[PDB]
Paper text:
The human EphA3 LBD was crystallized in complex with the receptor-binding domain of the human ephrin-A5 ligand and the structure was determined to 2.26 Å resolution with an Rcryst/Rfree of 0.19/0.21, bond/angle residual mean square deviations (RMSD) of 0.004 Å/0.78°, and no Ramachandran outliers. The crystals contained one heterodimer in the asymmetric unit with a well-ordered interface. A notable difference is that ephrin-A5 is more tilted when bound to EphA3 compared to other EphA/ephrin-A complexes such as EphA2/ephrin-A5. Thus, EphA3 binds ephrin-A5 in a manner similar to EphA4 but different from EphA2 and EphB2. In contrast, the pronounced tilt of ephrin-A5 in our structure brings the ephrin ligand closer to the ABR loop (R indicates the EphA3 receptor and L indicates the Ephrin A5 ligand) and burying a larger surface area (as calculated with Protein Interfaces, Surfaces and Assemblies (PISA) and Shape Correlation statistics (SC) software). The EphA3 C strand lining the bottom half of the ephrin-binding pocket is remarkably twisted, which enables extensive contacts with ephrin-A5 residues outside of the ephrin GH loop. One consequence of this larger twist in EphA3 is that residues S49-V58 from the C strand are brought into contact with ephrin-A5 residues located below the ephrin-binding pocket. Ephrin-A5 inserts its GH loop into the well conserved ephrin-binding pocket of EphA3. Nine residues of the ephrin GH loop penetrate the ephrin-binding pocket of EphA3 forming contacts with seventeen residues of the receptor, and six of the nine ephrin-A5 residues interact with EphA3 through salt bridges and hydrogen bonds, consistent with tight binding. The strategic placement of L111R, which caps the ephrin-binding pocket, is unique because in all other Eph receptor crystal structures a proline occupies this position near the edge of the ephrin-binding pocket, leaving the pocket open.
Author numbering:
A (entry chain B): 27 to 165
B (entry chain A): 27 to 201
The structure:
Amino acid sequence: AVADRYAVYWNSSNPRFQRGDYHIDVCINDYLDVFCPHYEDSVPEDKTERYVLYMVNFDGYSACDHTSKGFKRWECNRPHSPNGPLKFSEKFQLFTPFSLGFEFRPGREYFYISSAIPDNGRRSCLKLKVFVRPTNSCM
Amino acid sequence: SGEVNLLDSKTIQGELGWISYPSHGWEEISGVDEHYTPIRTYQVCNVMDHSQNNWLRTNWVPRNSAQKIYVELKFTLRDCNSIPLVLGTCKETFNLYYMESDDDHGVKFREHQFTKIDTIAADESFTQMDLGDRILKLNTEIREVGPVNKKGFYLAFQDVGACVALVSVRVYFKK
Ligand SMILES: *[C@@H]1O[C@H](CO)[C@@H](O[C@@H]2O[C@H](CO)[C@@H](O)[C@H](O)[C@H]2NC(C)=O)[C@H](O)[C@H]1NC(C)=O
Ligand SMILES: [Ca+2]
């Protein structure tokens, strides 16, 4: 319908995560779908990419730190999941009907990062910036 | 002596074949359950819009030979007073419906074919304070599905202007 839907394939083989400047401009009430890495069952666990997806503030986004300033949004620990890749869905709505949900405002920026499973000490985390566009730009 | 699920919204397969009417009503949005497991939830909050009549229909559910069928709902519901933008009058209930059917596919959705089981209320509505402090104000409501004289049935949820997150829907019988 009227809203737009964005699909992000969140894995280290996606060249959009390359420079660490992957961003998308969305409108209020738009959708974002994030897909976990998925592999044929013959691929062993240790050779598959797994992680936790966090929503963090700008500071956490910059330093790849989810601990002091982040919320867990999704877990990609099923690389062989039935029915295809696990899919995280977000709607950029003003008000959440979920007491642990997340709210969005026009004109503001939001940040996601992933932390690998199993955990290494890297600070080369995959990340995404989401800019929620002003109301005037979204009719 | 043991429960057998006919439908679980938290399993990958259980959340397939659901339909919203209309779109932009009930939405499929990632959330978390009471066991800190990220799951698909079903949410609606169109209180900044007029004349809402949002339906959510589950996949077809077999009744097997089971006599008594239960539906377990886990949800959060927002206090209307805690919502900065409300255009009409916000509700703090939603409706549960069912419809018996022999067919799991090719069934055009028709509201008038659905029988109301109950109006669902929240023992606890959450506010901005709950949002800010990250409190999970989870409600649990168990109902029974009416007489099913077909091979199975669809369940449906109706929203008429409430701010509701369906965290979990589980349909089951006991053995
Ligand atoms: C890692 O990400 C890439 C995209 O960067 C995935 O490849 C895409 O898969 C989707 C759905 O299968 C296709 O529609 C796209 O055309 C593919 N590539 C591109 C260029 O967009 C890839 O599947 C992901 N790998 C894993 C392990 O899941
Ligand atoms: Ca841009």
